[PDB]
Scaffold this active site. Structure first.
Site, PDB file in Angstrom:
ATOM      1  N   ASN A  80      23.374  -6.800  18.140  1.00  0.00           N
ATOM      2  CA  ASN A  80      23.633  -8.202  18.427  1.00  0.00           C
ATOM      3  C   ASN A  80      22.901  -9.144  17.483  1.00  0.00           C
ATOM      4  O   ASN A  80      22.824 -10.346  17.761  1.00  0.00           O
ATOM      5  CB  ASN A  80      23.249  -8.508  19.876  1.00  0.00           C
ATOM      6  CG  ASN A  80      23.908  -7.560  20.862  1.00  0.00           C
ATOM      7  OD1 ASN A  80      23.233  -6.892  21.646  1.00  0.00           O
ATOM      8  ND2 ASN A  80      25.234  -7.496  20.825  1.00  0.00           N
ATOM      9  N   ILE A  87      21.265 -14.432  16.229  1.00  0.00           N
ATOM     10  CA  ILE A  87      21.304 -13.696  17.486  1.00  0.00           C
ATOM     11  C   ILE A  87      22.488 -14.198  18.298  1.00  0.00           C
ATOM     12  O   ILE A  87      22.599 -15.402  18.563  1.00  0.00           O
ATOM     13  CB  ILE A  87      20.000 -13.872  18.282  1.00  0.00           C
ATOM     14  CG1 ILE A  87      18.784 -13.502  17.434  1.00  0.00           C
ATOM     15  CG2 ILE A  87      20.049 -13.050  19.569  1.00  0.00           C
ATOM     16  CD1 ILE A  87      17.493 -14.094  17.963  1.00  0.00           C
ATOM     17  N   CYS A  88      23.358 -13.285  18.712  1.00  0.00           N
ATOM     18  CA  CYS A  88      24.517 -13.618  19.540  1.00  0.00           C
ATOM     19  C   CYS A  88      24.328 -12.962  20.907  1.00  0.00           C
ATOM     20  O   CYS A  88      24.509 -11.749  21.051  1.00  0.00           O
ATOM     21  CB  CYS A  88      25.817 -13.163  18.883  1.00  0.00           C
ATOM     22  SG  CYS A  88      27.226 -13.034  20.021  1.00  0.00           S
ATOM     23  N   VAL A  89      23.962 -13.767  21.900  1.00  0.00           N
ATOM     24  CA  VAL A  89      23.734 -13.287  23.264  1.00  0.00           C
ATOM     25  C   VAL A  89      24.980 -13.663  24.059  1.00  0.00           C
ATOM     26  O   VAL A  89      25.114 -14.780  24.565  1.00  0.00           O
ATOM     27  CB  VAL A  89      22.459 -13.868  23.874  1.00  0.00           C
ATOM     28  CG1 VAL A  89      22.201 -13.257  25.253  1.00  0.00           C
ATOM     29  CG2 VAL A  89      21.272 -13.641  22.951  1.00  0.00           C
ATOM     30  N   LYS A  93      26.078 -17.268  26.207  1.00  0.00           N
ATOM     31  CA  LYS A  93      27.144 -18.218  25.900  1.00  0.00           C
ATOM     32  C   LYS A  93      28.124 -18.353  27.064  1.00  0.00           C
ATOM     33  O   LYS A  93      28.650 -19.445  27.308  1.00  0.00           O
ATOM     34  CB  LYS A  93      27.869 -17.792  24.620  1.00  0.00           C
ATOM     35  CG  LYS A  93      26.953 -17.722  23.393  1.00  0.00           C
ATOM     36  CD  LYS A  93      27.701 -18.002  22.097  1.00  0.00           C
ATOM     37  CE  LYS A  93      28.441 -16.782  21.563  1.00  0.00           C
ATOM     38  NZ  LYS A  93      27.639 -15.526  21.610  1.00  0.00           N
TER      39      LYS A  93
END
Lengths: 149, 148
Positions: A80, A87-89, A93
């Site tokens: 991720n 950082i893509c959580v 989102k």
């Protein structure tokens, strides 16, 4: 930043610096509060154990309407975390609203070091290995931790 | 069994002195292999505000093998079975004999933030989590209000 946003960011950073989550140290930037730097201890029982991972939360853009943008400054092998450190959580989102604090963001990032999300990964190599060859994913994550953590 | 006794006590101390955020351990002299625990529901999850009681059952091979975990507080969660068992695949995933009770509890708390729908023990909750998150959270929140 606009004055009313500065007030909220100052309250958020103060409470967070006074009571940081376990294994996280927060370093507020007096000159610029759009820029919150954080170190996260790589949790035990993960390939990141022993390392310190510097990261940055960008509180500019549309915060609190939108979640802050997170970047790892420490190189890391994680499904991720993209090539620029972004950082893509996904949980965040989808779950976000303006009432969620920065404590929950950081707690969510630290917990993602324990439970990475291989689906829709940013680092496809790490995501592909995590699902299909976990020991290989751990080995690479650990070697990157020995060099960068 | 001595290595159990001395290690159990050693873990408690570490956990009473430097407790993890929202986690409390309660040792029992009568049965040291049965450790009572409470985890606060993380903020931002449908479990927020709830106090989740649980217990770790340490085997006599500990820490060669992970403890087995049970939620005593009812919870709606893909990886908690009908009897409250916490999926052994989450503890086992990266277990080594240098790990202790702190890491087990940190991992379980973190699982409340990041549940795993695949190979879910509660297939109902795993399915809802993926396809209709709104109903998933709502069900988890309602059970938290009653049981947490």
């Amino acid at each position: 930043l606009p004055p009313h946003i500065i007030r909220l960011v100052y309250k958020e950073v103060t409470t967070l610096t006074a009571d940081p989550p376990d294994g996280i140290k927060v370093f507020p930037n007096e000159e610029d509060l759009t820029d919150l730097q954080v170190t996260i201890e790589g949790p035990e029982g993960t390939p990141y154990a022993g390392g310190l991972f510097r990261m940055k939360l960008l509180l500019g853009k549309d915060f609190p309407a939108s979640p802050p943008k997170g970047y790892f400054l420490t190189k890391i092998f994680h499904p991720n975390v993209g090539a620029n450190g972004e950082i893509c959580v996904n949980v965040l989102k989808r779950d976000w609203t303006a009432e969620l604090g920065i404590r929950h963001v950081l707690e969510t990032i630290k917990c993602l070091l324990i439970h990475p999300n291989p689906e829709s990964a940013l680092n496809e190599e790490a995501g592909r290995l995590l699902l299909e060859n976990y020991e290989e994913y751990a080995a690479r994550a650990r070697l990157l931790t020995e060099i960068h953590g």
